[PDB]
Design a protein around this ligand. Structure first.
Ligand SMILES: CCCCCCCCCCC[C@H](O)CC(=O)SCCNC(=O)CCNC(=O)[C@H](O)C(C)(C)COP(=O)(O)O
Ligand code: SF4
Ligand code: SF4
Ligand code: FES
Ligand SMILES: [Zn+2]
Lengths: 83, 114, 27, 116, 77, 687, 198, 83
């Protein structure tokens, strides 16, 4: 229903996370500006393919695995969630 | 990896023993109730037997099933004979013990232990 | 060189805990 | 002979431990830490597998501490992480291995405290 | 110190309860022979090895010398 | 390879030049019997109980001070080095008073053992013993110093770890007594460590005077929750009540030392403690009632109230597991007004990139720094075992400490740049003198204590510091993994809260008042019934009745960190696990379950039903909570600065002042401490 | 305070240990005369009947009586149980220890054929530790209760068990009950942390 | 009330025990009997205290009656010694 927060869990040093890391270095600074106070809790993965969670209105959440997903892809994936 | 067999080589081979025990027990429950003047009904008891033979129904290491039979048979010997009194056999029925609840709310509501 | 005086045990321990006593008057 | 099997040798059904003490109970493999009160390091060399701490209550009549955790005074002692994880897996308990914490080498010199 | 006391083992034939009874009655008699030697030849000395690490220190010593208090405390605890 | 080769009874180990003979024996595995030698204390050679015999050498050498040379074989179990111990132990024991059944370091004696293993079966001292005069060093240390073996560990600790040089030796001969010449109490944090460090039971703990004896004490290894350094500790429990908390060694966090607060406030844990779930009744008095009734009081109000009418002000010592069980519940009724009492500026990336709010340089990094600019905190009384870190690195290494706060007792020589938040701008401009000092620093670090952030211009103070860290980093050209910006906390449940996604500050609750508030261990005055809607339905979830209890429509007692397998995380994000030392008292229950149960009565049941499951939940919200004893490095700072640059705020001229100005400020700071009789005795001693 | 000992024995027995190791190379893994002047021949579990038969019936080593059969359980070792057989030679006035290793699920053979003394000891090892003896006549619980579940002397078994008994009037029988002890057994952590110089 | 408290609160159900019975309580409190003893005056700076016995008393400890300000008290007998 209504996005309440988006937690991007990205491994720190792996091919999979690679690019996800890029998203942060290329767009987080802007995403936060664009849609501020949208809790975006970027946190760390542990040898677990990068994932993007997102709470919604009433305890609802969705997962999207982005292992080896490239940068641009992530960018959109974030934009898709905060449609 | 390789392991010496206790008595059976393949799980299937062993199960042959597991069934040769089930039958034995089944054909014995009736006798016990009468001999040990137990009060539970033949049907009731025979239920217990299946339960147990069933409780162990998940192991796949033949050596373990080769071992539980033995322990299993031993328990018959005693029960077939009256080496075990009523007290012993009836202990399989938790007559006094109040079955512990499992629902979380049912446990949270009583006892700090999980 | 029936008797009433029967030993009865205690817990001679000073109770080892203290519960919050709730506030006396309401708010 | 030499049959082959692929299990973690769960002898949980040969052990004889009541289910609830094999299911809801977590062993904690760890190398005991030193008693700060003493400086002997002979009690921090072998890995121990102790179980969870359940209710320790008071006997109403005499005030003693009573308990219903049969596996409360249990502290199995192994000689390596490998041999403790194996036993816990063997018996069907859940484990929480804690890596050893040997002091690192700290360089000590008598003269150093005389510099100015 | 049995190596220093003299006694005769009472062996028996016809391994039957009786021969076994007779042997038990003889060992009681042979034990009186060993008890006789022990009373006749018991040496003056102390009754416990006195390296305090193994056997506890004497009551007077633990109450007057520190090494003995430490050895009593550690041995008992 | 500068290893030099030396023989330990033949094992022929190879060691760095400059390792002591005692150290050489350690790597082979042999232990030299030792007194007056502590690993993190200077070598003194006072006892000489460690005499060993290097080979084909004339005399015995002190393993604590002799640098091992090339090809010296140490003979640790020779016929000589045993007469060198059988004869020293003769002396230590000769003047010793035999009150081992008084000395509560009975089984915790490094002098009976060494006597009982390496010393002598008998005594030859047929003469008269000596006696010294018991003095008062404080209300925490009982110095029955007739016990003292003049090993000078105390004097050193007091001078090298704690910078308080009050203790000292007085007199020569056999009446050298190591006590303060004038009777001035040894008042300092880090004080209680003397107990643990004196191997003799001369000075021991006064509260734990005679309550127990060590063989009985069952020892459970857990985590310090009183302060945010998260010091490792061992809780010694006998027959189910905690008897003493003593340090256990963690190289990185507390290396064998714990604070005075987190060792003598175990007594506070046993009184004023909530146990049964009372519910306001009758005229308003709280009345003890069964869980079922108290829980549905709360559940019924929860079903009635919608989102943003239900809020949670958590804070203090609540664990991560309760914090996720309280968020998952209030989101299942769609209020994300979950908040913490300590306000961390969120006017930025805020709580979003851990780099923002975590001492980035680890506690152990303070050892490698080159200059530290502490701004806004009295590290001493906020995080004592981090003040010690800067203590050791200012002594053994050469840290140049600079404080922008109140000039305050820091146990070391700092440079007081000033008491003004705007002079932070002065360094950013390069105007102030220390600007070059940092320019000269190859590995500098900046520390901003949350205690500053808690003022109104805290958002501006964080932004101003981030600007200076930015050009400090640019001017120094410091390498990326070296991390200049870090901020230290003083509340155990802050970092975890912030990580789990809890938004700091009660500012949101202030603007819109919630019909129902579930205070979760909050004893702070951040909101009051006076500041709430008229309905003001509020339910305290905690362990000690202090401020939140008497203004509470429901009391749901919880546990304390001695009584649950919860997780906490200190300031550089190292998650750590408390183990259950004692079962929780009364009907009191673990914090996570109360909230799982309330959810079941409410009907929005939470998914987990066992704690491993809640640990799996934590993995979903923040994944470095399921990971213990690990500090993770991803310095998402550069983007943090960009948002800091966007934020515009004014740093008011009011000087930034740490709330704990002097040590009486420190003793009592939390429920488990404000209830401490020992802390109370300490407070009046200072006053 | 130093035992009065004879070196003759250490040597004589050491020599027998080499003799047994030479005569049976296939089953003996390690032979050692301890300093208590006793001998221990450690055999592969398969050598239990060959090694003991050679000792029971060899002119130069007659070991007619089985003093005892016991199983130390070192939980660490992979093969936890260490069955130990102590044997006595009336002819040569000397004693020997043959010890082999058995795991929870790998049974070892039964020596009842070699010595009929073992018929009972092997039943006690099964009841106490759970080691199973192959082709053993009548193996069944010697010491534990008829319905006992679990092998008691295993180091992983709680001192006080899991079940206790009481008479329940309502059922008029001696009923079992999960163990609740009125005073837990204070476990004393008495063990010094300063090791002894060897 | 025993020398160490223990007195049951009126409401305590733990009082039935003493019904048709009574309470074993020693009337001779050692807190007071030891106070009903003369401070042992001495000449020497330090004094011994074998517990009034050799091997029938308590371990022998030497007390420093060095300050009249405080009468040394052997930790075993609670006997105050007046310099
Ligand atoms: C009245 C007195 C009660 C006494 C009851 C009785 O003596 C006790 C007893 O059952 S003695 C232990 C029996 N336990 C086994 O005999 C092993 C079974 N082995 C399996 O179950 C496997 O997992 C298998 C692959 C066969 C599953 O297949 P399946 O489900 O059996 O079909
Ligand atoms: S210190 Fe206390 S315990 Fe250790 S010896 Fe001296 S008196 Fe006995
Ligand atoms: S007090 Fe403890 S530490 Fe200080 S000198 Fe005497 S013994 Fe050594
Ligand atoms: S320990 Fe070597 S000098 Fe005291
Ligand atoms: Zn006295």
């Amino acid at each position: 229903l209504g996005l309440r927060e988006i937690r991007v869990h990205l491994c720190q040093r792996s091919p999979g996370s690679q690019g996800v890391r890029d998203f942060i270095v290329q767009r987080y600074v802007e995403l936060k500006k664009a849609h501020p106070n949208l809790p975006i809790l970027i946190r760390e993965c542990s040898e677990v393919q990068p994932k993007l969670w997102a709470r919604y209105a009433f305890g609802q959440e969705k997962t999207v695995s982005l292992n080896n997903l490239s940068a641009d892809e992530v960018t959109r994936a974030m934009q898709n969630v905060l449609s | 990896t390789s392991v010496k067999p206790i008595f059976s080589r393949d799980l299937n081979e062993a199960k042959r023993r597991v069934r040769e025990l089930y039958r034995a027990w089944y054909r014995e429950v009736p006798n016990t109730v009468h001999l040990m003047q137990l009060d539970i009904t033949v049907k009731q008891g025979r239920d217990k037997v299946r339960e147990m033979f069933m409780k162990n129904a998940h192991v796949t290491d033949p050596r373990v099933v080769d071992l539980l039979v033995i322990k299993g048979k031993m328990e018959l010997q005693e029960t077939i004979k009256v080496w075990k009194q009523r007290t012993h056999v009836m202990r399989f029925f938790h007559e006094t013990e109040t079955p512990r609840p499992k629902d979380f709310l049912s446990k949270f509501y009583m006892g700090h232990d999980p | 060189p029936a008797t009433p005086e029967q030993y009865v045990p205690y817990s001679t321990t000073r109770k080892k805990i203290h519960e919050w006593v709730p506030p006396s008057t309401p708010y | 002979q030499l049959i082959t099997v692929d299990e973690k040798l769960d002898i949980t059904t040969l052990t004889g431990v009541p289910e609830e003490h094999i299911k809801t109970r977590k062993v904690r493999i760890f190398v005991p830490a030193r008693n700060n009160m003493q400086s002997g390091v002979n009690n921090t060399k072998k890995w121990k597998m102790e179980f969870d701490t359940r209710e320790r209550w008071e006997n109403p009549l005499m005030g003693w501490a009573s308990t219903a955790d049969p596996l409360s005074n249990m502290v199995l002692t192994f000689s390596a992480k490998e041999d403790a994880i194996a036993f816990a897996e063997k018996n069907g308990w859940s484990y929480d291995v804690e890596e050893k914490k040997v002091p690192k080498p700290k360089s000590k010199s008598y003269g150093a405290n005389f510099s100015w | 110190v049995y190596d220093q006391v003299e006694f005769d083992v009472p062996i028996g034939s016809r391994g039957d309860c009786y021969d076994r009874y007779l042997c038990r009655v003889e060992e009681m008699r042979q034990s009186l022979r060993i008890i006789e030697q022990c009373l006749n030849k018991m040496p003056p000395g102390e009754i416990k090895v006195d390296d305090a690490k193994v056997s506890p220190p004497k009551r007077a010593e633990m109450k007057t010398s520190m090494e003995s208090l430490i050895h009593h405390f550690k041995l008992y605890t | 390879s500068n290893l030099i080769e030396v023989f330990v009874d033949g094992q022929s180990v190879m060691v760095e030049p400059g390792t002591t003979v005692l150290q050489a024996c350690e790597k082979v595995g042999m232990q030299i019997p030792r007194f007056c030698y502590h690993e993190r204390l200077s070598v003194a050679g006072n006892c000489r109980m460690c005499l060993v015999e290097i080979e084909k050498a004339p005399k015995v050498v002190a393993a604590c001070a002799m640098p091992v040379m090339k090809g010296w074989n140490i003979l640790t179990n020779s016929e000589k080095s045993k007469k060198a111990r059988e004869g020293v132990m003769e002396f230590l024991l000769a003047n010793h008073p035999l009150d081992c059944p008084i000395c509560d370091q009975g089984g915790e004696c490094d002098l009976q053992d060494q006597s009982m293993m390496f010393g002598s079966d008998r005594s030859r001292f047929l003469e008269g013993k000596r006696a010294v005069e018991d003095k008062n060093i404080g209300p925490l240390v009982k110095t029955i110093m007739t016990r003292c073996i003049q090993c000078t560990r105390c004097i050193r600790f007091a001078s090298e770890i704690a910078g308080v040089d009050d203790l000292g030796t007085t007199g020569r001969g056999n009446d050298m007594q190591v006590g303060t010449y004038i009777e001035k109490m040894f008042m300092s944090e880090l004080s209680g460590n003397v107990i643990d460090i004196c191997p003799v039971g001369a000075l021991t703990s006064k509260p734990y005077a005679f309550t127990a004896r060590p063989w009985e004490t069952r020892k459970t290894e857990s985590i310090d929750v009183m302060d945010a350094v998260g010091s490792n500790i061992v809780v010694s429990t006998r027959t189910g009540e905690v008897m003493r908390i003593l340090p256990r060694m963690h190289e990185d966090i507390n290396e064998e030392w714990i604070s005075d607060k987190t060792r003598f406030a175990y007594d506070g844990l046993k009184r004023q403690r909530l146990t049964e779930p009372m519910v306001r009744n009758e005229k308003g008095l709280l009345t003890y009632t069964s869980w079922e009734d108290a829980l549905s009081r709360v559940a019924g109000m929860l079903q009635n109230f919608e989102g943003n009418a239900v809020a949670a002000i958590a804070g203090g010592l609540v664990d991560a597991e309760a914090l996720v069980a309280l968020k998952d519940l209030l989101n299942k009724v769609d209020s994300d007004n979950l908040c913490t009492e300590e306000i961390f500026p969120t006017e930025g990336a805020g709580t979003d990139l851990r780099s923002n709010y975590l001492l980035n340089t680890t506690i152990a990094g303070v050892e490698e720094a080159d200059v530290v600019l502490l701004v806004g905190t009295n590290p001493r009384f906020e995080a004592p075992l981090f003040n010690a870190r800067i203590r050791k690195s200012w002594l053994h290494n050469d840290l140049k400490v600079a404080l922008i706060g109140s000039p305050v007792d820091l146990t070391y020589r700092y440079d007081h740049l000033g008491d003004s938040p705007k002079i932070l701008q002065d360094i950013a401009s390069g105007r102030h003198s220390f600007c070059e000092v940092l320019k000269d620093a190859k590995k500098p670090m900046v520390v901003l204590g949350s205690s500053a952030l808690q003022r109104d211009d805290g958002a501006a103070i964080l932004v101003a510091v981030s600007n200076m860290v930015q050009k400090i980093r640019v001017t120094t050209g410091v390498a990326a993994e070296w991390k200049v910006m870090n901020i230290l906390h003083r509340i155990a449940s802050q970092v975890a809260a912030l990580d789990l996604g809890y938004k700091p500050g009660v500012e949101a609750i202030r603007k819109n008042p919630p019909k129902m508030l579930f205070l979760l261990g909050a004893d702070g005055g951040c909101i009051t019934r006076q500041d709430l809607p008229k309905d003001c339905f509020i339910v305290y979830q905690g362990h000690h009745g202090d401020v939140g209890a008497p203004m509470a429509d429901v009391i749901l007692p919880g546990a304390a960190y001695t009584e649950k397998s919860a997780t906490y995380v200190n300031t550089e994000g190292r998650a750590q696990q408390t183990k259950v030392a004692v079962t929780p008292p009364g009907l009191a229950r673990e914090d996570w379950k109360i909230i799982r149960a309330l959810s079941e009565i409410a009907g929005i049941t939470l998914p987990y039903d066992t704690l491993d499951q809640v640990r799996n939940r934590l993995e979903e919200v923040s994944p470095n909570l399921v990971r213990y004893d690990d500090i993770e490095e991803t310095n998402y700072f550069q983007q943090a600065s960009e948002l800091a640059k966007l934020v515009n705020q004014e740093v008011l001229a009011d000087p930034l002042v740490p709330p704990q100005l002097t040590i009486k400020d420190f003793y009592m700071t939390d429920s488990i401490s404000r209830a401490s009789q020992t802390m109370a005795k300490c407070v009046k001693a200072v006053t | 305070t130093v035992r009065p000992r004879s070196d003759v024995t250490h040597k004589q027995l050491s020599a027998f240990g080499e003799y047994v190791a030479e005569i049976l190379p296939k089953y003996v893994q390690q032979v050692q005369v301890s300093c208590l002047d006793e001998l221990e021949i450690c055999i592969h579990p398969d050598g239990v009947i060959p090694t003991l038969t050679f000792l029971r019936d060899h002119t130069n080593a007659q070991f007619k009586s089985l003093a005892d059969l016991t199983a130390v359980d070192v939980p660490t070792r992979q093969n936890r149980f260490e069955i130990v057989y102590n044997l006595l030679s009336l002819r040569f006035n000397s004693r020997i220890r043959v010890k082999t290793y058995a795991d929870e699920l790998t049974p070892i053979d039964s020596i009842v054929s070699v010595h009929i003394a073992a018929n009972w000891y092997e039943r006690e090892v099964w009841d106490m530790f759970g080691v199973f003896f192959f082709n053993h006549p009548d193996l069944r619980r010697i010491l534990t209760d008829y319905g006992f579940e679990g092998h008691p002397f295993r180091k992983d078994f709680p001192l006080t068990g899991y079940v206790e008994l009481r008479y329940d009037d309502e059922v008029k029988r001696v009923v079992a009950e999960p163990v609740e002890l009125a005073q837990e057994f204070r476990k004393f952590d008495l063990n010094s942390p300063w090791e002894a110089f060897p | 009330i025993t020398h160490t408290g223990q007195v049951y609160d009126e409401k305590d159900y733990r009082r039935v025990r003493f019904v048709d019975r009574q309470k074993e309580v020693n009337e001779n409190f050692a807190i007071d009997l030891i106070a009903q003893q003369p401070v042992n005056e001495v000449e020497h700076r330090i004094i011994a205290c074998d517990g009034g016995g050799g091997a029938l008393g308590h371990p022998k400890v030497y007390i420093n009656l060095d300050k009249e300000t405080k009468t040394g008290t052997c930790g075993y007998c609670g006997l105050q010694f007046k310099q």
